[PDB]
Design a protein around this ligand. Structure first.
Ligand SMILES: *[C@@H]1O[C@H](CO)[C@@H](O[C@@H]2O[C@H](CO)[C@@H](O[C@@H]3O[C@H](CO[C@H]4O[C@H](CO[C@H]5O[C@H](CO)[C@@H](O)[C@H](O)[C@@H]5O)[C@@H](O)[C@H](O[C@H]5O[C@H](CO)[C@@H](O)[C@H](O)[C@@H]5O)[C@@H]4O)[C@@H](O)[C@H](O)[C@@H]3O)[C@H](O)[C@H]2NC(C)=O)[C@H](O)[C@H]1NC(C)=O
Ligand SMILES: *[C@@H]1O[C@H](CO)[C@@H](O[C@@H]2O[C@H](CO)[C@@H](O[C@@H]3O[C@H](CO[C@H]4O[C@H](CO[C@H]5O[C@H](CO)[C@@H](O)[C@H](O)[C@@H]5O)[C@@H](O)[C@H](O[C@H]5O[C@H](CO)[C@@H](O)[C@H](O)[C@@H]5O)[C@@H]4O)[C@@H](O)[C@H](O)[C@@H]3O)[C@H](O)[C@H]2NC(C)=O)[C@H](O)[C@H]1NC(C)=O
Ligand SMILES: *[C@@H]1O[C@H](CO)[C@@H](O[C@@H]2O[C@H](CO)[C@@H](O[C@@H]3O[C@H](CO[C@H]4O[C@H](CO[C@H]5O[C@H](CO)[C@@H](O)[C@H](O)[C@@H]5O)[C@@H](O)[C@H](O[C@H]5O[C@H](CO)[C@@H](O)[C@H](O)[C@@H]5O)[C@@H]4O)[C@@H](O)[C@H](O)[C@@H]3O)[C@H](O)[C@H]2NC(C)=O)[C@H](O)[C@H]1NC(C)=O
Ligand SMILES: *[C@@H]1O[C@H](CO)[C@@H](O[C@@H]2O[C@H](CO)[C@@H](O[C@@H]3O[C@H](CO[C@H]4O[C@H](CO[C@H]5O[C@H](CO)[C@@H](O)[C@H](O)[C@@H]5O)[C@@H](O)[C@H](O[C@H]5O[C@H](CO)[C@@H](O)[C@H](O)[C@@H]5O)[C@@H]4O)[C@@H](O)[C@H](O)[C@@H]3O)[C@H](O)[C@H]2NC(C)=O)[C@H](O)[C@H]1NC(C)=O
Ligand SMILES: *[C@@H]1O[C@H](CO)[C@@H](O[C@@H]2O[C@H](CO)[C@@H](O[C@@H]3O[C@H](CO)[C@@H](O)[C@H](O)[C@@H]3O)[C@H](O)[C@H]2NC(C)=O)[C@H](O)[C@H]1NC(C)=O
Ligand SMILES: *[C@@H]1O[C@H](CO)[C@@H](O[C@@H]2O[C@H](CO)[C@@H](O[C@@H]3O[C@H](CO)[C@@H](O)[C@H](O)[C@@H]3O)[C@H](O)[C@H]2NC(C)=O)[C@H](O)[C@H]1NC(C)=O
Ligand SMILES: CO[C@@H]([C@@H]1OC(C(=O)O)=C[C@H](NC(=N)N)[C@H]1NC(C)=O)[C@H](O)CO
Ligand SMILES: CO[C@@H]([C@@H]1OC(C(=O)O)=C[C@H](NC(=N)N)[C@H]1NC(C)=O)[C@H](O)CO
Ligand SMILES: CO[C@@H]([C@@H]1OC(C(=O)O)=C[C@H](NC(=N)N)[C@H]1NC(C)=O)[C@H](O)CO
Ligand SMILES: CO[C@@H]([C@@H]1OC(C(=O)O)=C[C@H](NC(=N)N)[C@H]1NC(C)=O)[C@H](O)CO
Ligand SMILES: [Ca+2]
Ligand SMILES: [Ca+2]
Ligand SMILES: [Ca+2]
Ligand SMILES: [Ca+2]
Lengths: 389, 389, 389, 389
């Protein structure tokens, strides 16, 4: 292998084609399928794999009771062959913990998991399947990270991590890794007031991360990283089209420099956007209140124009169905002249919205860009909650 | 690897020997086995694999209820090691959708799946395990394809696709792929009035496809393709021995140029034939009404002689047992001086004929030619439907 | 790889050490384990694997009902990693049928399965994972073979096959294969009156097979093969120590040339012996009536001396436990200066002796020679039949 | 591969980071997970794997009843991918028996299992996946070994084995293997009065084993081995901090040369320590009576100073949770300039402490050293015993 260099431009995207869907909850109704949440996909020169945080129990198992809980000693980052559902028989355990990121640098995979008590968490950084670096909490308040893939360039893989309050100012850092070893640490700069769960992708030597402000904004922070100089800037997505959940109705004008407040009752959800001038796409839940539905909106100059609105759209999950986290990934090793945007949607089932069952889990759907105008339908989870009762 | 060239003649066949049988319904009564339908086999330089369209649930799972349904967001083309039954633990997800084809060109495997709503379906073409091409519906009416393997020659893999009515004239095309990229598109020519679900095989630079006319004919359309010139002709199988289901009693004379109408109540089933002058074999269900039984009939000059009849036969599935789809494949990489014909029979269990259960699934049996005169017995599914009730 | 040559002598054996045990019935009480019978082991340059005839259902599955039945379209030769229990998730399907043999020639594995109706069975010969040769029944009466491994020398792999009555004279042949292709066919010569289920091993250019006479003898036929000249002789094991089941009490004198009759009520069981002058070991069930217990007896010159008796023994399965078939195999690719004898015992559970359950299956234990004097205990199946009721 | 040489010093350790956790009992409540005990981890150039002694049944299976029993013909040493739970579908059977050790010499893995009756047990030594050496019991009283990994240096892998009483003087030997072949046998020397279940690690040409005295001492024997000269010494851990279970309260002064008696009611448990001057860490159960809790104590000069006490600590399992065996391993092939200490804790569930269920099994947690001061929490098993009732 050789280090991945972000030499290619982002592919132009007119619509989104289906890449994978694991149907994990449908299958797990009667097969041995692990309870998960916070899934994503990440690729390497050989292909793409699914990742998620296991809860250390099967879906039909009695220990699925209580799995709304975010952090326990029984969680682990697992990865498995794309399209399969995660079972205790087919998963690779990448690391142990309850917040993660992973990316392949062209030679080996780096995986990072945080674990431990809220006031004393720590990250273990794995490279090539072995632990190489450990990082203690710097603020004593739930050290945590992206919950989707990082991006590498010339062997340098930046990772955004946050430690501190979910509902007040926190301490966010960008750590630049090479072979799992810290090359540089930056404190977050810029105008984003709060940063969690960054979804990142790269093209032409630039890494862009679209994140979650859990404190104030219904608009999403955007971090722009130069992995060569190891420097960054941050602000908010300018567009009036707000993409956090919960959020208020979209105003007539967005805000690049400050959080747009409002919405009820959730303070945030992980999400993403591809930001490339006219070739810009924003994902969001269809409901402004809850994690239901998912739509892709083509919003030219969303990153820079406070008045930018949608010129096209594609419903990914209809609003009668539950969604969840969403994030970016790219098959940087595809046989193409451009890097083609891909994304996944986490389809959360169970608590708290379906509180008739005792568990919380998800399945995954993933799509990639097409220059064609492709028809669309809803790629909802497809399980009947009544079958679990 | 090097591109497969169809340089060899078709092997002479006197009888059929057992190749594989997965016993999927028997096993799935108590193991975690995926609900499937529309199966086939396809080979590569390493060996042969089984393929089918999953329904995204196990057979004993509650979500098996309703799996008579043809098209949903929970279906995918899966492949697995020949002889094993398909489980969520052992399958490779080739692509996502509800109609498929797949073939190996000698270097990598191309897999194609259609998905989406009836009026806006699309094909995603995968090559070497990555998506490379997308094709939108051209007629807005269930874009669909072969449901068995395609065939490649010098890197060129033609695929027959249809978009339009199941019960009226439709828009069929032959798309010639190379590395999953479109080289040429032809509109279907010839006298076949309606084309679905082509079963194809190749020898000496010729690709022959035997298809399903769902509109009029109880005789099967035959498409003859030159993968070098990328041109084709089409007509009907000439023999009076009719091989669609449903069909009327065989007349005294077949018809090469026009559909022979009649039969009740089904308009069609996927099937196949090997057409090589005196070395010609037709498969069909034993019942002229329903998908029950399966027989191989040696009908010399079936392709060209309207009066041709059987000179030998071999029952594959007795008429007291359910059959289903059937199709052609060949291990083009076998250590032999000729390409030996193989075929599979889909053994459908459940709805609509066994409506005492809520599901529809199948198992697979596959056989290959022998120059020996081998004894035969019935290779039925072998599950007891009562055990599922 | 290079062809295996039988250049080495047989190792001296003083006792038997444990090699593997799959505990298949214990595990299968609650895991997805295939119903099997007629198991064996066979090695290759990479290691050893377990083989058996699947019944195409799991042990706890409803289709296990009726699995006392010997021959059905739902059986297949399966192989799996030594020590694991056979599941639908971990087995390789070698071929389809209800009688088998398999062996590796140093380059690739040959596997043979018979299938079909009693009066019209056929063998399909596979080599390197592909079917290469087909053989029709020559006597129209259950064409069948060894049910344990064959042996190869300089690419030549002889296989003993029988077609005809189980209770009268039958037509036995030795077929000499190379790369799955017939090199020569011999009709059985010698004084053995009936030959079934040969257990074979090789050393110094000689292949010896110890078989089952189902017609007359309670003494076992022995076939001695020269795989270079492709010729053989046959007679009975000379020793007064009789090793078929059922059998009468051992007489004062054995018989080399003719069957010793008597015993009740079973006409035979597959078994084996290692015959090397003073270094000779006979296996047999402990009960002279039934398939219970298993003992290894060191009987110097058993092959040639009608008065030879045991000078040492090792109980493998105590007589309070069920046994079954037994057979020979050798890791011909071991890092040793001699070929070390190994054997397996099939531990049959269920019908007909435990008719309180509806099924018949087995687990496996396998042992190899040691020059040490090792302590021994019983390696019985270990399942409680009551747990299955 | 090339032989591992113990050329590197031991890494300095300030705290312990999470390496792996399989959650086997949680998962096994509803998945097919093997009953085990006596687990460990062992690495090779490719990575690390989990090992344990299977009981030849699943956890939910009826045959789990009675698995408190230590020795049966249904046990085997199994290994599996680190982090997964052990299932009959994912384990490699290393050898058959009820006491084991395993280690990789840089080229291949040696695995050893004892099996047989108490008065006639024997070890089978496997190398490169094949049996190479057999060793009969020398004292006729439960020949047994380490239950964690051995250590290799220049191809020489010493193994500590004991044969004789659990409650009186026994016959312990160190056997020096190369490629599974005995190079030398030493009778145990030194002042340790009784030696069982040694936990070993190596650095700078020295192998140190920390063991269990089941006869007298609540202090742990320490064996120091020179794998080049193939010689050793033994005595007790000097520290007043006693680390066997059961044990009395720690005295004011430890004892290097003689057992410190007392404690009730258990005579011993397998444990470990890393002994490197000031860089010394002792593990022990938190309860002095029972196998509950687990703590790591940094005790400078524990090996040599009878008055040495803890200067820091880290709770691994809180005292409200069950622990069990603990042992040492090191990834000798890590990309580091020092050998970093790792350890596992066996988390025993079921009998005899939870006698409300009929079974005994365990899960695994494993941790490795860090020079960072990392926060900690309890890594208990996490299953609810009530769910199994
Ligand atoms: C076969 O497949 C084709 C390819 O997939 C498909 O092509 C699609 O065709 C449709 C119809 O021509 C096109 O729709 C167009 O979309 C743009 C953008 O619409 C989006 O944004 C507007 C504006 O939203 C903002 O303003 C409103 C207030 O005005 C606020 O509520 C909102 O929050 C924003 O602030 C929005 O109104 C649209 O809403 C629609 O869609 C959402 C889901 O996203 C629904 O929840 C909602 O009820 C409503 O239906 C939408 O979000 C719009 O400006 C145009 O007027 C036009 O509607 C698609 O872009 C196009 N897609 C692609 C990928 O080409 C074919 O239609 C299909 N054929 C058939 C027969 O099905
Ligand atoms: C050991 O194994 C041997 C190898 O497998 C096996 O060999 C077989 O031997 C039989 C008997 O000699 C041969 O049978 C021959 O078959 C031909 C062709 O028969 C087929 O076609 C005719 C004509 O069908 C058309 O016409 C009728 C009206 O006349 C219409 O109904 C029909 O729709 C067509 O339009 C057909 O009548 C036959 O029907 C038989 O078989 C079908 C199943 O296909 C049954 O449903 C039906 O009830 C009837 O039994 C058949 O379809 C025929 O012309 C000859 O007269 C002769 O019957 C096999 O060809 C031969 N097979 C091979 C591969 O060599 C041995 O028999 C076996 N030994 C034993 C003891 O079992
Ligand atoms: C630790 O392990 C050691 C190694 O495993 C073990 O060593 C064993 O020690 C014993 C005792 O010294 C030795 O036993 C010897 O065996 C020979 C051969 O015995 C076998 O054959 C005779 C003769 O059978 C024929 O004749 C009789 C009529 O006389 C017929 O019934 C029969 O059908 C034949 O025609 C037979 O009588 C023996 O029967 C015994 O064993 C069978 C099981 O095979 C039982 O069913 C039966 O009830 C009876 O117990 C036997 O089949 C014998 O001639 C000697 O007199 C002596 O008995 C072992 O050979 C030896 N094994 C090895 C591998 O070295 C240690 O004993 C063990 N230590 C402890 C404490 O357990
Ligand atoms: C974020 O994470 C940090 C890193 O993990 C963590 O850092 C830890 O900080 C604590 C507090 O400053 C340090 O604790 C120190 O530990 C030493 C050693 O204590 C151990 O040994 C003593 C002595 O035991 C012997 O003597 C007594 C009689 O006096 C006997 O009972 C005993 O059997 C021995 O003979 C012992 O008393 C201690 O007992 C404590 O811990 C045990 C568990 O091991 C409990 O069961 C018990 O109830 C009690 O709590 C202990 O065994 C001690 O001398 C110091 O005074 C101080 O207590 C840790 O060393 C340190 N760890 C590391 C790895 O750096 C931070 O605390 C954490 N932050 C937060 C907010 O949680
Ligand atoms: C298998 O799937 C079928 C189809 O989904 C299930 O049948 C359906 O069951 C639901 C729930 O009882 C029925 O819904 C009801 O419909 C009536 C009339 O529309 C409405 O008034 C009620 O409030 C309720 O919505 C539905 O009609 C019914 N459909 C059919 C065709 O029978 C069936 O229960 C499933 N079986 C199993 C064993 O899971
Ligand atoms: C778990 O395993 C234990 C131990 O095998 C089972 O308990 C045993 O059950 C058997 C059958 O009921 C008892 O056998 C009986 O013993 C009496 C007295 O010896 C005898 O007179 C009877 O004819 C019969 O043989 C056995 O005593 C009993 N052992 C103990 C220690 O209780 C138990 O049933 C198993 N539990 C489950 C849920 O499988
Ligand atoms: C605590 O809540 C945070 C995370 O949010 C939630 C969610 O569904 O919204 C999922 C995570 N679950 C896991 N990653 N396991 C959380 N993050 C963690 C570390 O708990 C939030 O971002 C506030 O800081
Ligand atoms: C809709 O019916 C078509 C297909 O037919 C049926 C069948 O059992 O006959 C199976 C397919 N199921 C799947 N491939 N899933 C269909 N084809 C599709 C695309 O639905 C028919 O050929 C008419 O156009
Ligand atoms: C029919 O009985 C024969 C075979 O014997 C039996 C047995 O348990 O004794 C197992 C086989 N089961 C299978 N191999 N499946 C048989 N052999 C066959 C071909 O049925 C016997 O050797 C007489 O010819
Ligand atoms: C018999 O007890 C010994 C072993 O101890 C126990 C235990 O939980 O304490 C587990 C083992 N279980 C297994 N390894 N299976 C034993 N060791 C054996 C060989 O039984 C002890 O060390 C006394 O000699
Ligand atoms: Ca927010
Ligand atoms: Ca038709
Ligand atoms: Ca006999
Ligand atoms: Ca002790």
């Amino acid at each position: 292998g050789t280090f991945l260099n972000l030499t290619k431009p982002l592919c132009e995207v007119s619509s989104w084609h289906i890449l994978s869907k694991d149907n994990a909850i449908r299958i797990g109704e009667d097969a041995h399928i692990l309870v998960t949440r916070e899934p994503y996909l990440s690729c390497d020169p050989q292909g793409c794999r699914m990742f998620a945080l296991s809860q250390g129990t099967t879906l039909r198992g009695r220990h699925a009771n209580g799995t709304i809980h975010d952090r326990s000693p029984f969680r682990a980052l697992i990865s498995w062959e794309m399209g399969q559902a995660p079972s205790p028989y087919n998963v690779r355990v990448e690391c142990i913990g309850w917040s993660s990121t992973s990316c392949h640098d062209g030679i080996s995979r780096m995986s990072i998991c945080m674990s431990g008590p809220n006031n004393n968490a720590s990250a273990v950084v794995w490279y090539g399947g072995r632990p190489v670096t450990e990082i203690p909490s710097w603020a004593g308040n739930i050290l945590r990270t992206q919950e989707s893939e990082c991006v590498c360039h010339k062997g340098i893989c930046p990772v955004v991590m946050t430690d501190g309050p979910a509902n007040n100012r926190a301490a966010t850092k960008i750590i630049y890794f090479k072979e799992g070893k810290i090359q540089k640490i930056e404190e977050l700069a810029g105008n984003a007031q709060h940063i969690e769960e960054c979804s990142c992708y790269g093209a032409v030597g630039v890494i862009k991360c679209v994140c979650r402000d859990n404190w104030k904004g219904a608009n999403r922070p955007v971090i722009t990283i130069d992995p060569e100089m190891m420097t960054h800037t941050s602000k908010y997505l300018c567009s009036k089209i707000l993409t956090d959940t919960s959020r208020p109705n979209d105003p007539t004008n967005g805000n690049c420099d400050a959080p747009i407040t409002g919405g009820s009752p959730d303070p945030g959800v992980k999400g993403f956007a591809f930001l490339d001038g006219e070739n810009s796409w924003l994902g969001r839940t269809i409901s402004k209140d809850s994690r239901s539905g998912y739509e892709m909106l083509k919003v030219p100059n969303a990153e820079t124009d406070t008045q930018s609105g949608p010129i096209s759209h594609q419903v990914i999950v209809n609003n009668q169905n539950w969604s969840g986290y969403s994030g970016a990934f790219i098959d940087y090793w595809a046989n193409k002249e451009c890097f083609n945007p891909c994304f996944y949607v986490e389809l959360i089932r169970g608590r708290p919205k379906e509180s008739s069952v005792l568990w919380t889990s998800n399945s995954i759907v993933a799509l990639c860009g097409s220059k064609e105008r492709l028809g669309s339908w809803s790629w909802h989870d497809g399980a009947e909650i009544i079958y679990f009762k």
